[PDB]
Amino acid sequence: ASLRDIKTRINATKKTSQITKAMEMVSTSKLNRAEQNAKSFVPYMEKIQEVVANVALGAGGASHPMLVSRPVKKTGYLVITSDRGLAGAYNSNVLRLVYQTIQKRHASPDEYAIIVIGRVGLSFFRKRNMPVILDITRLPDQPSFADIKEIARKTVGLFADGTFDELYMYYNHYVSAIQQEVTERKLLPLTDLAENKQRTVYEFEPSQEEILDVLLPQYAESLIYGALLDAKASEHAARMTAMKNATDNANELIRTLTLSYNRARQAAITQEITEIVAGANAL
């Protein structure tokens, strides 16, 4: 490689390193905000979980609780991905798990459907020609409940509509800045609920079959929102880690390239001076 080529490579790598460092710091701040946003959601989830556990337990209930007896004509899959790359294996892990799971237990596209959050997953499924029925494809960095209210409402409505009798949802669970766990959870029907007490209900019942009909969809939507918050935190952590690694690799490459450039420079100067002296004393 010539001196000009090595110098151009050095400058390009320096610019790339600066960009990656800036992206890492921005993602760090976004991860902090996502963690506090997820923290702000805990009391509502705890309240609704307690209310559902108190009310639904001990009765037949609506078509949502248990109802394992419902035969499965079609299974719905809800997958949460990001809208941008540079997040490491964040999207690839979830997409591979979804693909393997559906291929392991479905023989035809007629018996399952997919709801996708994120254009990278959307493009994945479109390139693999799979039956996607819903998508959002554009979401803020710190989404609010109103951002996914309509899509969660449609998803929970499709279960009672009889379109499909099963909900599975796949997302990355935030454990630390280095570890993200791909998670599968059964959303609908509610497979099982725990118990803290039997009579800690808020609304003393006017009518069970009416309170359940409004309580259960809200519980499902809250679960979807909590998973979305977890996924956003995981995405920001993944971006931060990936950009940190990219910056470190770029710095190492800059170091080695500079060493090679200096060797080439010294060798050049030697060659011209030797040629000059050889020509001079040839006379």
Partner: protein, 119 residues
Amino acid sequence: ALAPEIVGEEHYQVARKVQQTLQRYKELQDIIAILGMDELSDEDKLVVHRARRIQFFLSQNFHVAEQFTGQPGSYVPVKETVRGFKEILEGKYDHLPEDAFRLVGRIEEVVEKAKAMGV
């Protein structure tokens, strides 16, 4: 001597396809060096997956090298070499770990040592 009328048509095809995959792998080294395999397309991921295994399978344990390590050497006929590389190119052994292709000889030894280790 690398010509279809000297070594044979399938030998020539296998050699050229191996060289093509290795060239494509070489063209990506800067991208993998900076940011790894995560942003590669699906085709390039398969190219890397095949190329690393081909590159490792090009290694061999020599009879003479038995003094440096206790592993005895192997003699591989050219028919066996061609068949093994054709099988690797066809995607037969995509599920085997890439460390099982190091310093073995025939293609069956790759399966044997993959079984000996965890698989």
